[PDB]
Design a protein around this ligand. Structure first.
Ligand SMILES: Nc1nc2c(ncn2[C@@H]2O[C@H](COP(=O)(O)OP(=O)(O)OP(=O)(O)O)[C@@H](O)[C@H]2O)c(=O)[nH]1
Ligand SMILES: Nc1nc2c(ncn2[C@@H]2O[C@H](COP(=O)(O)OP(=O)(O)OP(=O)(O)O)[C@@H](O)[C@H]2O)c(=O)[nH]1
Ligand SMILES: Nc1nc2c(ncn2[C@@H]2O[C@H](COP(=O)(O)OP(=O)(O)OP(=O)(O)O)[C@@H](O)[C@H]2O)c(=O)[nH]1
Ligand SMILES: Nc1nc2c(ncn2[C@@H]2O[C@H](COP(=O)(O)OP(=O)(O)OP(=O)(O)O)[C@@H](O)[C@H]2O)c(=O)[nH]1
Lengths: 221, 220, 214, 221, 221, 214, 220
């Protein structure tokens, strides 16, 4: 046995492979999925979890679906007017990732987990949060709470096709069985400077939410 | 109001085709061909559920047909000769021909005269979805007084077109279908090659039609 | 005695191989690879029943493994190139290599070091049953400290040899196995072609072995 | 509406196809299997019946498994010493076919069937019961009882491969799921003259069995 | 405490009495019945087993019904033409007895039994398997495997009447509740020389079957 | 066709008699007399099952009748006098007369006028199967307008004749009947003795017939 | 306190014998021989019920034994010769000998050394109940170290004696037993004939004892 680690798991190919690759090494994974409250057609996720339990047994130690709608709202939606007028870009989905990270601090500290993993693989332009500017920021944030952030399947596959057929060799389906954010395809591409500035602007809020969830303060930042 | 048949895989394109028919008041019989080389088909049932939920009685049925015999005869039996001649793996074109042979039999025995599929403009790179193939199969189906339509062909200029119409129906935008083991196992053929293959295998397909009708046991 | 694994399809030859091991006191794990292109495999369960009936606990289990991914990668993904180069459809040889890659993983994770199959002399036309293939796969399995035997190879000079030894065991003589959709879909290859194909796909097989092992 | 015909059905691919081809034409078939009491490992037959019911429904009107062991013994076994010393050939399986035909006269008369069909194929002419000379004899025999004997896969089947792949196209397994006679591979090849002489010697016994089964005589030939 | 012995049990009155007489002495019996695949109407056997369990309880340690059809075919059926042309006699039932004995070597070695018993009787010496010359041969055969072959009702049974009324005294039916070989009344009487020659010709096959069943060879004789 | 009754014991001969009637389209009522001195009659039900399996509704029913009282009165009550006079134990002939007395009653109350048994030529040693007995009982039954036939008498020159016609019907060749405790308890009588015994007990049988009819 | 066996038919005499033993604290195993010629035996169970009701645990069991084989061999097989020699039907004497042979076996295998029956003075006209028979059977049973007693013999000078003792026990006075088909089928024999028959059939009885013990299969 090894100490379980957490995987940020959406049901997509890439995070599926991340979890699978960990488990192939004997590393038990706690699958963690954030529900932001604006995600549609999330039913299929259960089919993917089933496939993974079938192939790896006990190594899937559990699947947590967390309601992060409150943190998401506070970080990304309450000041949507301000946010879009300032950055000229809809960064709601970036805010959601910050909300995920706040929740993960709480989850990790309450469940004795010190390693989290994500599904970064080959390069994907659509996801600003997979950029070094954002991942550096997020890694820093998690390290302030002594949480180790890994990307175990980084550049392990060259392309989406490489991810699909590695999963097929594992006896798992190639599809991305994830819910769809209502904000999918609802934004244009931001610069790295807008990404970093947004993360820095909302960070105080995220940290405050972390403190609230730990029972240390009610007061705003 | 008389049911029509939809060639249904669970993909977003065939889903939309069936849904759009049902929105017009047309009951659809969902028909899925199992060629025997299809992996991870379990998720299909989630899609069927979505459609029953949204349209009720207008989904008059779901038939899963074993077409592995016809598929093998058309597309696999002579695979060495086929690939050495055409220099391309056209197995999935063969599968569509096998589907159509079976559908003549199915339509004749179940009193259906209109079949529909999800072929789309944005997927014309796949041989079975090329105008040249569709035209050939329309003529084939008309020889048996069967009307073959493709109700999402002209509209779907991208997968996004299909996605957002599905979402408006309260249906997931994903393709909840099985994967052929022959996915990503082929390079793109010319139109000349697609037409030549269809013409070469047509005698076999028609022979399969005759066998399924109990009119011959003898070879093409 | 320590269990050994048998590559078991339900066919006469692999049935007899498993049975002959069990008659010697050797418990067998029956292992069946599903490549994703097999039809009418329901009858297999009738044969497993016959074997459980005749040998009891010596049948320690029956694993049906999904090997469709490895099979696809080795044998199907480059089928155009493969057929244009060798002028022969060697998909079923590919399947055998995919079986052996999966078996490395299976053996390491389940503490088995002896694998057995039903290859027979009388089926030498089929590439996976050629001496040159067998020799290659024995070398491959020995690189992972796995002993690969073929306990009915030398004896079975005809299907009749196998049939009547099965009958003596109170077992049906038929091959109660599934049918590959690639049955009767190929012409006969040379030994040189079988060896060259195995050597070309071996790097991929070893890569799949490493992936399955993390 | 369409009148059922009977198929002599063993579970082999040839008789399976014969029955299937009839049913494809709309002809309901009564599947008839003779158990001679020397047949081993007959359990798999029911798998084949299931496949056929699955593919054709109501057109399978029934499956009769008949005990023909008594007729078989009387015609083929009781005088085995004399039979083999005279003909120099083990013709028990020819005797079985005669016993089948005697039983079928009775069955057809009692069940209002006038057309019987079997799976004889060109590719299986080595076996005595599938030799033109035997078939011709049995056709004549059946016609004396106003029974039409047909062999609907005879001319088509130039090889087992022909039969297999027509079954596969029907969604049915290619295998011969039939029991095995203990007399399999227990004989060498007989001449036509010997097959005809044997049939003509045992014919009186067969006709006598027909009459007994109809309740017209108890007396021997 | 008392070590079980095996009885070759058909349901006939002679083997029934043999088993019963053993059990009356305190000797537990394993009833062993060989099914050669040519035996008809075997259902009544279970009525006889019931009678014996009723009368003797625990002393009936078991009833094994063994499939010996393969050994029987290989030794008696496969070369039936040659066998009958050479010996001028149908000795299939002698072959069956050899097949029984081969199977019993295997059964005795695997089940720790060293004494087998049958129901041979003086009054049934017409049949080859119950001829002194056959019994002597099979005794020798069994002794080569350190198996003691006994016939506990041989000297007593001067007629079927002797056996019947000793059964009746045990509260057991007098009938032979056994299946019937299709080869019943299918043979004329052989000489001793012919019985010995046949046994000696098929012996190599029997010993080979013994070795196969022990997992020591696949090769033919 | 109108049902007929068969005197059925489960033995070969009566089994074949009933079967041969049914093959002709004649429904049979199977009738078995229990004399009170029969052992191990459980196996009879196996034979009835075989016959129902092979002929269905043509078996219209199976009556097991207690005839112990008539049997006792005819054959047992005066056994000392009977044996001292005839020098032979004729109890089983008595049983047959008791069967026939009961059958008069049964036939009148159940609308049957044809009775049949399994008597055979090959069993002429047994008094109830002698021509002289059969003739007497046919006369007796005709006094009550009952037709008494023996449909396997002339044909069965040996038990083998019966056996192999049964086998042809898919029925076991064995006699699945009970055993009289009087089996093997008697020496062979003359025809004169059989006739004289029947004639002496006939008044008693007719009296029992009248009693059963009120 | 060690069980003894009672030869029990359901009749008033054997009922009283068993009851009187149980009144003294002696547990009884009720043993009933079925010779295969016995009619209307169903009422026996009513009598057993009465006795269980009145005595509880002291009724340790009820064995019904099939003795038809021994009965047939001793009494029926040679019925012609037996009646021609003795001029009397002694089948029911034979039955009692068969009962006693079976009881040697039963006693040896079930660790019982005392058997008891209901023979009575008032029924001395029946051969099995005659002093001369009882004496012979006592000697026979003593050769196997079995004690044979008849605990109601001397007291029962009439059926009325038995009746009224039963009634005092809360038990019905009737004989709730089966009837032999050989009831009223015999005239009364002399003592000489009873003794001679017993002596002639004794070798057969002892042979049956040996067979039941697994010591011989051979004839007397
Ligand atoms: N011939 C043919 N091949 C198809 C068809 N649909 C899918 N495929 C094959 O199977 C593969 C499946 O990949 P996609 O359908 O793109 O998978 P997806 O998850 O829906 O979408 P992506 O996220 O873009 O991979 C294709 O790349 C083709 O090789 C079709 O209609 N015809
Ligand atoms: N590569 C390969 N092909 C095989 C093998 N066994 C069968 N095949 C192919 O499958 C075809 C049919 O196989 P089956 O359906 O089992 O038929 P069969 O081998 O002739 O045997 P039966 O079914 O007993 O008549 C063969 O003619 C070959 O083309 C095998 O071990 N390897
Ligand atoms: N009167 C009379 N006695 C019979 C009859 N059948 C049998 N028995 C007597 O019963 C004895 C044994 O009968 P079964 O036990 O049937 O024996 P079996 O007749 O020799 O026949 P199997 O049991 O087949 O060997 C005979 O030897 C006769 O003494 C019958 O029909 N009438
Ligand atoms: N040998 C013998 N015969 C007996 C015995 N008990 C009864 N029987 C016979 O069976 C007949 C039965 O008649 P009972 O016992 O008198 O009948 P019951 O109804 O108890 O008394 P009753 O009202 O007097 O008739 C006797 O007449 C004897 O013939 C017995 O102990 N020994």
């Amino acid at each position: 046995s090894v100490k379980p680690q957490l995987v940020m798991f959406t049901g997509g190919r890439d995070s599926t492979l991340a979890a699978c690759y960990l488990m192939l090494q004997g590393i038990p994974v706690h699958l963690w999925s954030g529900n932001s409250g604006c995600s549609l057609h999330r039913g299929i996720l259960s089919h993917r979890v089933e496939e993974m339990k079938n192939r790896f047994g006990d190594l899937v130690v559990g699947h947590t679906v967390a309601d992060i709608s409150g943190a998401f709202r506070s970080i990304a939606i309450e000041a949507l007017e301000q946010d879009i007028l300032k950055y000229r870009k809809n960064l709601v989905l970036l805010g959601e990732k910050l909300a995920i990270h706040a929740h993960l601090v709480d989850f990790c500290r309450r469940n004795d987990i010190n390693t989290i993993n994500d599904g970064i693989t080959h390069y994907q332009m659509e996801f600003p949060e997979q950029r070094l500017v954002a991942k550096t920021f997020l890694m820093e944030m998690m390290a302030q709470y002594d949480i180790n952030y890994q990307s175990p399947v980084y550049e392990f596959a060259q392309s989406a096709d490489d991810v699909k057929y590695r999963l097929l060799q594992l006896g798992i389906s190639t599809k991305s069985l994830e819910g769809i954010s209502i904000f999918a395809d609802s934004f244009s591409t931001p610069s790295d400077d807008v990404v970093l500035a947004y993360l820095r602007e909302k960070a105080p809020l995220a940290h405050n939410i972390v403190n609230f969830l730990a029972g240390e303060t009610l007061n705003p930042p």
